[PDB]
Amino acid sequence: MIEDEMSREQIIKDGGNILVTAGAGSGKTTILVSKIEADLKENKTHYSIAAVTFTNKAAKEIEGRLGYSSRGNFIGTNDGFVESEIIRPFIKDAFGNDYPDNFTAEYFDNQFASYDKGLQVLKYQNILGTYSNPKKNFKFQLALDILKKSLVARQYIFSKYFKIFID
Amino acid sequence: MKFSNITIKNFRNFEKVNINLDNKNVIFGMNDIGKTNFLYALRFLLDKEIRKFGFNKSDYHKHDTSKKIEIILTLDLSNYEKDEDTKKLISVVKGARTSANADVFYIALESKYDDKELYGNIILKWGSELDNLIDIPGRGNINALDNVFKVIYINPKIVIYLIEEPEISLHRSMQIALSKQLFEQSTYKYFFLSTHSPELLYEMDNTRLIRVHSTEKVVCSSHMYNVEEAYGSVKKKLNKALSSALFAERVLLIEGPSEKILFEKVLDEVEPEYELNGGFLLEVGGTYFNHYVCTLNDLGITHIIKTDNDLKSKKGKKGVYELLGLNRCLNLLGRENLDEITIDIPEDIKGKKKKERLNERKKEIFKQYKNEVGEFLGERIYLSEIDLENDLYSAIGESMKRIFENEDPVHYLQKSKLFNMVELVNNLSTKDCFDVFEHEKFACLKELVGSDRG
């Protein structure tokens, strides 16, 4: 039934990578919830999903429509995904035992413009900082370097997470 | 995932007991208290219903001495390089393990002392190494380990079964059905089984057998059990012979049921029920001695072997003979089988003088290899000179020529092995049984009765 119904029925029973070019707001999160409800009910294994949004308020709205679950799903911002799944469990493995595991990550004070100087903030004064440029991400690039270096980070993120939902 | 070992540093009945593990474990022994405390230690480590109550005063070795209970389990978390099972078995935990190439995973328990506030305060920790152990992160009343293991306890998600005494109020055909179900069907991937009936071990393979010693201080010995492809065609007979013999203290390995007739008549006359103290007669015939000796010496059970010196003709070859009787116990001793020997005899008469010629030959090869016979007698391997029948004629020969009106009484009993032995032991007296018990060639009976020196 024209562009409305056939787009919904072809997006529920799909199983591959999906690129949806939705409109200018007004309910893009309806299909994000409805796909997750279809994907979680279809899959009966121990694998869980991960939903990523930018603002924290939309993460609560996705969580509100979903309900609650004990499957180990991650619903939240992309900053919370990188800081809690890649860096904090595996900082002491990939970048030496002397690197600390607990830190506070403020993005209000630091304005450094070097990667190697960035590790000196984390190693010495227990602060996780941010890059100088808006066209950079020190947190997301550190998660790429830890995943590329250590092994047990790669043994985690494939075997728990089924599909990452991006918005 | 394959269980490696469990060590209990303290419990209500254990002092320093370390038991090697595998999948499909079977525990037995004399001390039932130690078995149920082993299963209770497993429930304390892996089940929340016993974990949430804490420790009491009574669950210690001494009730005030050395207040430190530790139960450590080894997991062997990695798999083969051709399988991606390693990743999804790794999945649940994040920061326990440090090394990128970590092969071993530990699950440990820690108990607070009971001097203050009168409680146990169960503290759990995993980690990849025994040092720098990290506490299990729990957010509410459920910690992270509860979503991994699902423990099902049977007594009349990784699924772990714990079965305690399933043979009670059960017919034996259902016990054979049950043993087929755990040892063949892939649903029972992990279990621990405590049993007292041999019918639950009638079909077993790729299993770990744990025995508890009879002493009040429990010592546990474990053996990994496997049946090879060469023994797979007659596997049921070894399993049925071994399941009943696993529950004894001293065993005797013999060849045929005629030796069972003779030895059981002798033991009934001289010994007041040797089976009560743990003596068992084992029936093995046509197979090799290495499997039973390995599975009994690894399990802590002493074994005594009485065997004959027999010659085998080689199939399709005439005049060449095999030294089976020596070679079985040399390959028990780890030595290679000796070379094949031959004799050149005319056709003559095949009935009577032939057995005399091989009897003289057997005496010669016994006389050639006396140092090996001394090493054989160093262990509990008692080898007869020609047959057991000639030792019987050397022992009870007067009564044997009294019973048998034949001039030689050793030929009539070799004419029919089974029927002549029953008629021999039917008209026998008590004094002759003490005579064969006294004789040095039948010292296997003296070792089977197991009289303690001190």
Next chain:
Amino acid sequence: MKFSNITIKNFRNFEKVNINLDNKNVIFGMNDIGKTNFLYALRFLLDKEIRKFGFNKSDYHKHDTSKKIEIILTLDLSNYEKDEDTKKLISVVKGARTSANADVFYIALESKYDDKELYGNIILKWGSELDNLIDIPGRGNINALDNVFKVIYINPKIVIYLIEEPEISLHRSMQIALSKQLFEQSTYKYFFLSTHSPELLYEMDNTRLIRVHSTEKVVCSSHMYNVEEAYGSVKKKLNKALSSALFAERVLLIEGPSEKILFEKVLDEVEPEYELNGGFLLEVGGTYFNHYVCTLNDLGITHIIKTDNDLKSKKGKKGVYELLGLNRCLNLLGRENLDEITIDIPEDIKGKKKKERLNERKKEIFKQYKNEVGEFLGERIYLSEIDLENDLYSAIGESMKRIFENEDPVHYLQKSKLFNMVELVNNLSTKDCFDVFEHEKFACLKELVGSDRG
């Protein structure tokens, strides 16, 4: 005194079950509910702790149909004339027996219907005759029968024991010691024993064996078990052989372990675990089949017998033989043993050609007694023509020609019965197993499997 029989005219699981009794009774079977209701019937007749509660509505065959429960027991009050126990046995009761020359005594139970007031109203009557039954005099709460019989019930003044499943949480050596305590010590003069483990019957004498059938409507069969003085020297072998075979539905009696190896390999290949549905292989060596066939025909367990037509030389005489393998089947059918036969054979070569003369004489004797062979075939008696190996050569002889590089494959199997046969069953394919299963000479396997005709 000596218990004779029990009839249960109505109970929660019984309709018209009549069981003959004795001292030292043993009850077993597939139906556990029938055994525990038999023991509860004994408790209702013989104990006050169950009598004082009365009958409930659920303790009937149908809950409203045929509300009349009668449990009758017979005592055999008379003793021997050389023992003065008769007067002391009689003098507990006075008015029950009208004449002093009465032989037997009755104890009966009667239940008032549960239509009104919803209560059982247990009434106890005794007397010497079934007609004009009289009540048991109870002056207060304790009746006159309670001072006579004392019931001690064990579950994990004439004394009657009631033991229900004592093999729970017990080591098997303790079970053999308990069987010695039950069947040897004169303290346990009267008991009723229910068990599911064969280790409590490793030795038994002067006992009554009660078997409960596998159907829902219970039919019970009883047999008086006794070991004669001729079999007393090998009584342990018969008891250990029979204790495991008592808990099966279809048995096979064979001679040696080579037949066990062959039949276990074949039945492991074609049949999906015959041991599940009630198949068992029993080892008979050196003894006649009469004891096993009586103790299995009396219990309702079907029996299949496969044996060899063998010849045995007489003691002290040369050239005279006995038709032993035929005499066993003849005295299994109740006929007397035939007279011995003599032949004149030259000395020749005693190894090979004498077996050929014995084989053609065996064929001549097998052709001569064909009517008795057909009479054996009418029952489940399968007698081989010469040996079992010749039937194997008639079935799969080309396969053994492939296996053994000798031109004749049957003699090398007679050269060593235990070692060559293992090498035969090791190099066997799955096609030959269906061939030996489908042959007319091996219909004992088809009778052992027991496919339901309809």
